[PDB]
Design a binder for these strands. Structure first.
Length: 1156
RNA sequence: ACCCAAUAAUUUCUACUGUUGUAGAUGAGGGAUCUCGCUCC
């Protein structure tokens, strides 16, 4: 198996040596903000938008179908939808001319409306949250944090930005006023104020904030500035219009009366200093200027509506002549008669449709109605000469506006772009460490000229570095970059090379090639061959001449790949006093690259990240065409000190001072790129993924791991072997008993409460951090004891085991060892903060003073609450089918001991489909339960349950050595009764939760990785990883909305990890998976590389041997099959993983029945 | 002098914790048979 090409983000700490310049920007980034004003403006804006999108009709409030959308928006937010649309059109061959005047609208896209409505509702909810926050009376810091978080959430690339995009890229055919312009204008102010707010309230994000950008490639930086404002004004001047000249721009010879009517209508706005302009300029925030386009639109719409209303009323011809609809009152009485006849036909068809009794007949009537409507529209569009002329005129006008607009948009874009790339980048090496050097934009020419004159590389401890790289996209941006403005010097030079029209006109844009790969290939070949080009670009001419130029390719992909592959070079020079000279002459900025590790000579180990960076500079990596590559662009961020506590010194740490931070991108195994999968048509997806899987073979799978499914704390892991598949129960059980063979080593802490004292007189607890104990060196250094004492302590404290299964909850890796009980504090913290979160949520509701009364009863103790708990744990859809007696039986089943009632097989089967997950609630794990129904001391009747029931917490079996039993009850109870004294916001608690979850997954990842490696090495083959239930595809609603959903997190993380080894298909995000085929098929399997999924069939507690038996409370199977769990598995709860693995493997085998 | 009993060596988290610190984990779903326009539902 061979690795892919992979890209990882990387960070570093920066220390300032001399930063006089760069600092200026930071100074200039200061802004002002006002909370209340922002909230009010956002509320008003959101109020207005609804009138834009949503159409009338209380029966169904929904987004107008007929709304039009540009391709642009879709490509940034609706990838999948777009793709689907394309395929739909393409496949169907609804394109009998291979290029067309295409148009599209919302109603033309499947499911888009639901998406847009959801986004709008989410934004409204966030706005309400901000309003409440503003009106809040919390403590100062609390408030500040809350606000910050809210802003953060609001500002994400799933939010307001999206809406703005939508707005900016949409239009209405039937607008009557001028709302769209107002929304367009207000968008910019909202954006700027959001920016300001972010700036203000969030100066202490872990990543800091962007301040400047730099790149290594000389291509981009050398861009000289352009006086955009003057060109802006020049362009703007073209919109000036004289009222008399409006009709002189078209060939339509409108009647004098009609033209006078239009003039009067336009003159209606000739007042109050209003200035008439051809179009509209949002970019300049124009207001109090009237756009002719909009006026014509309005006139069109209004007269159309009036005419339709008149026909719907069946008024006479003479009455039409008396109307003011000058655009339509000029038609013939014959045309009016034909139109009225068609309208009467439509009325009859509608009456019949209302009289329709069958779907097919109604469909036929609707088709006839559509045909008649098309006939009416054809007649209207053909016969109405005045309408025609109006339309023509309108069209004439329209185009011009856009013309100018596009140019303006481009200019703006360009300006925005150029405002970023301030500095050219260089790296200096000295005494085994690296300094970062930035050169100002304006000195780049002299800097480049000077460097080229220096001597070549020399064997000395001082050196300088500078890159040069070429990529397909880079080249394309060079070639066709903003050619419209004529600012692209490069594009000028190459002009003679381009293809020509029939007219001999040079077509200065990519569309000239009409999608022919064979043409694009040849063109870039030529380009490269171009003498001019070679002057600006430094490239391996010798190699490329044969490898690129003088070659042919099957598809664009190969060319792309090749180009990307070869074009990468690195240079160095040496000279005395370079550091001084650069700062002296070119205003050079200097940074010191530093790390916690980089400083230390203890090369014992280093963080993962660090290894990459060090490996890059090694001599060997140079020979292999830089198997590790560094991207050409970088970012700089700044972070303010968070200091908000009273004085007494505390200690030195990060966050106590301002810090500069570096951002880069690095790649691995670049020599072997591959087409990265993304959102695609299902067919392509399936074909690709299946092709990848065939790389394996049936007989290469030596082993498999099962990951179980359960509640919030995660659950057990175990292995399976082919050999286990014996013929008889006796042989099976005998085989299984060979644990000594097939097993793996683990460690257990004998005593959680062990402790010792250091030379400092400070206590150390084993359960706080095993590391300080296990590791010989650490122990020695900390406690100065002898090696013999070390050995004695180790053998006394620690116990060894060999097992097939593991409790993954507490599992942790330490110094090449597996520890079952290694990490308690993490798990304790998770359960405690989950409990507080839910108690907070419950007390948040029932804000009205009647019977608030949470009771924390630790027991159900009453009916009508059991039912509600059952309701809470079960699926609605399945739950609805049960009768009250069935419900009761359900409850009993849930709560009652397994042997109390002889549940029928049908009852069991139906039950099993109800619950989300299984677990004991009476006798094993003693989880405390909440309800709030208690007005008065409880009674079987009354005491309405609608105040809800909730699953709070769990007692771990050791309690903990942490804290004390009495105090945990107190802590949890306190959290209900004493809300006020706890100074934490809901909106932040979620965040704090998330991380904890996030962190804890790490341990799991590590353990699985370790075991995988181990087994692989031992056996010399690849293994299968099986997980119960495909989760990522779900809704994730409610509490979960911002809580993580632990299994989802694991799902993604695990996948990510494996990606390195190249054992899974190159999927960029898991969301793309077409997981529909899994549901309800015990024999089914979904395969992704070596990773797979199976349905949750509820096989738990199923005997591994005899299948029939049930394992509840005894290590020995009650079915007398000879099976015993004592010697094999840590606990009976390991059993679920084993079954999972078995089943999965079996399925895997079966799938290749008709393929291998 | 007990309640706003909280915080705490890191590129950054999580446990811990003070001057050779220790354990595990760790990236970013944005690109050209164009662009911008007009009927009718």
């Amino acid at each position: 198996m061979e690795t892919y090409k992979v890209t990882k983000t990387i960070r570093f700490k920066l220390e300032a040596q001399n930063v006089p310049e760069i600092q200026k920007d930071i100074e200039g980034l200061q802004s002002e903000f006002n909370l209340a004003n922002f909230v009010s403006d956002l509320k008003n804006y959101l109020d207005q938008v609804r009138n834009y999108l949503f159409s009338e009709g209380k029966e169904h409030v929904f987004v107008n179908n007929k709304i039009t959308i540009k391709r642009e928006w879709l490509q940034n937010h609706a990838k999948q939808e777009w793709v689907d649309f394309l395929e739909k059109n393409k496949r169907n061959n609804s394109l009998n001319n291979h290029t067309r005047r295409i148009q599209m609208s919302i109603g033309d896209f499947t499911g888009l409306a639901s998406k847009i409505e959801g986004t709008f509702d989410e934004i409204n909810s966030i706005c309400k949250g901000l309003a409440d926050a503003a009106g809040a009376q919390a403590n100062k810091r609390t408030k500040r944090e809350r606000t910050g978080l809210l802003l953060k959430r609001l500002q994400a690339r799933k939010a307001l930005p999206s809406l703005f995009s939508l707005i900016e890229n949409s239009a209405d055919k039937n607008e009557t006023g001028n709302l769209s312009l107002q929304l367009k204008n207000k968008s910019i102010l909202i954006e700027q104020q959001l920016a300001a707010g972010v700036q203000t309230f969030l100066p202490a994000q872990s990543g800091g904030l962007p301040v400047a950008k730099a790149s290594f490639n000389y291509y981009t930086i050398n861009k000289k500035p352009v006086d955009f404002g003057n060109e802006k004004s020049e362009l703007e001047s073209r919109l000036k219009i004289s009222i008399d000249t409006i009709f002189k721009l078209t060939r339509e010879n409108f009647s004098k009366k009609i033209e006078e009517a239009i003039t009067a209508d336009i003159q209606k706005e000739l007042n109050n200093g209003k200035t008439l302009l051809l179009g509209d300029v949002p970019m300049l925030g124009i207001e109090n200027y009237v756009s002719l386009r909009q006026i014509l639109k309005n006139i069109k719409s209004n007269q159309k509506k009036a005419f339709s209303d008149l026909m719907q009323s069946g008024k006479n011809y003479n009455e039409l002549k008396a109307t003011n609809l000058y655009l339509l009152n000029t038609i013939e009485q014959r045309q009016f008669d034909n139109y009225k006849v068609k309208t009467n036909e439509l009325e009859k068809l509608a009456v019949k449709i209302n009289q329709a009794t069958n779907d097919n007949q109604k469909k036929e009537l609707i088709s006839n109605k559509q045909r008649v409507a098309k006939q009416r529209g054809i007649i209207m569009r053909d016969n109405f000469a005045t309408w025609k002329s109006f339309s023509n005129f309108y069209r004439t006008i329209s185009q011009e506006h856009g013309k100018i607009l596009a140019l303006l948009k481009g200019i703006e874009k360009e300006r925005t772009e150029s405002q970023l790339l301030k500095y050219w980048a260089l790296i200096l090496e000295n005494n085994g460490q690296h300094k970062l050097i930035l050169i100002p934009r304006e000195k780049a020419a002299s800097c480049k000229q000077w460097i080229a004159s220096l001597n070549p590389s020399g064997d000395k401890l001082t050196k300088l570095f500078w890159f040069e790289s070429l990529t397909y996209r880079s080249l394309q941006k060079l070639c066709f970059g903003f050619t419209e403005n004529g600012n692209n010097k490069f594009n000028k030079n190459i002009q003679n090379l381009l293809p020509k029209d029939n007219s001999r006109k040079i077509i200065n844009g990519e569309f000239a090639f009409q999608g022919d790969e064979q043409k694009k290939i040849k063109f870039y070949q030529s380009v490269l061959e171009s003498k001019y080009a070679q002057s600006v670009l430094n490239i391996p001419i010798q190699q490329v001449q044969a490898d690129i130029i003088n070659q042919s390719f099957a598809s664009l992909d190969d060319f792309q790949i090749a180009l990307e592959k070869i074009c990468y070079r690195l240079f160095a020079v040496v000279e005395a006093n370079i550091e001084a000279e650069l700062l002296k002459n070119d205003k050079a900025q200097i940074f010191n690259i530093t790390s916690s590790d980089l400083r230390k000579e203890a090369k014992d180990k280093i963080k993962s990240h660090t290894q990459i960076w060090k490996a890059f500079w090694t001599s060997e990596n140079k020979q292999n065409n830089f198997e590790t590559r560094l991207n050409p662009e970088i970012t700089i961020t700044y972070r303010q000190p968070k200091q908000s506590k009273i004085d007494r010194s505390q200690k030195n740490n990060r966050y106590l001072h301002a810090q500069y931070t570096l951002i880069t991108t690095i790649s691995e195994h670049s020599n072997s790129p591959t087409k990265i999968l993304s959102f695609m048509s299902d067919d392509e997806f399936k074909s690709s993924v299946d092709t990848f899987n065939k790389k394996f073979k049936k007989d290469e799978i030596k082993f498999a791991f099962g990951i179980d499914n359960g509640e919030v704390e995660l659950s057990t892991l175990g292995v399976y072997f082919p050999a286990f598949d014996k013929t008889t129960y006796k042989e099976k059980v005998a085989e299984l008993e060979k644990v000594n063979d097939y097993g793996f080593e683990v460690l257990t802490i004998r005593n959680l409460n062990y402790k010792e004292t250091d030379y400092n007189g400070k206590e150390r607890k084993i359960i706080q951090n095993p590391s300080y104990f296990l590791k010989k060196e650490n122990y020695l250094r900390t406690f100065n004891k002898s090696e013999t004492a070390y050995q004695k302590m180790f053998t006394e404290q620690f116990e060894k085991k060999k097992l097939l299964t593991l409790d993954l909850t507490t599992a942790k890796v330490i110094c090449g060892h597996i520890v079952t009980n290694g990490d308690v504090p993490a798990l304790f913290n998770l359960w405690l903060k989950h409990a507080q979160r839910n108690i907070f949520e419950m007390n948040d509701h029932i804000q009205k003073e009647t019977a608030k009364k949470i009771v924390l009863k630790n027991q159900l103790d009453t009916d009508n609450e059991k039912l509600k708990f059952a309701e809470y744990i079960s699926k609605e859809k399945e739950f609805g089918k049960l009768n009250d007696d069935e419900k009761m039986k359900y409850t009993k089943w849930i709560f009652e001991d397994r042997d109390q009632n002889n549940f029928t097989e049908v009852e069991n089967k139906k039950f099993k489909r109800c619950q989300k997950i299984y677990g004991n609630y009476s006798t094993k794990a003693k989880a405390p339960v909440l309800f709030a129904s208690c007005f008065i001391d409880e009674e079987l009747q009354s005491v309405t349950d609608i105040f809800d029931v909730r699953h709070i917490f769990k007692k771990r079996e050791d309690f903990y050595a942490l804290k004390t039993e009495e105090e945990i009850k107190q802590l949890i109870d306190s959290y209900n009764t004493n809300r006020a004294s706890h100074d934490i916001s809901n909106e932040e608690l979620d965040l704090k939760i998330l991380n904890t979850k996030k962190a804890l997954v790490a341990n799991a990842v590590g353990v699985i990785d370790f075991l995988y490696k181990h087994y692989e090495r031992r056996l010399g083959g690849e293994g299968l990883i099986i997980k119960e239930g495909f989760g990522t595809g779900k809704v994730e609603d409610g509490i979960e909305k911002f809580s993580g959903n632990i299994y989802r997190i694991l799902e993604r993380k695990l996948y990510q990890k494996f990606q390195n080894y190249g054992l899974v298909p190159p999927i960029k995000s898991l969301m793309a998976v077409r997981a529909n085929g899994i549901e309800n098929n015990k024999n089914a399997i979904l395969q992704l590389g070596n990773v797979g999924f199976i349905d949750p069939a509820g096989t738990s507690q199923e005997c591994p041997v005899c299948i029939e038996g049930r394992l509840e409370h005894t290590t020995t199977c009650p079915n007398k099959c000879g099976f015993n769990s004592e010697r094999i598995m840590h606990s009976n709860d390991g059993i679920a993983s084993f079954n999972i693995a078995k089943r999965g493997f079996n399925n895997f085998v079966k799938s290749k029945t008709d393929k291998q």
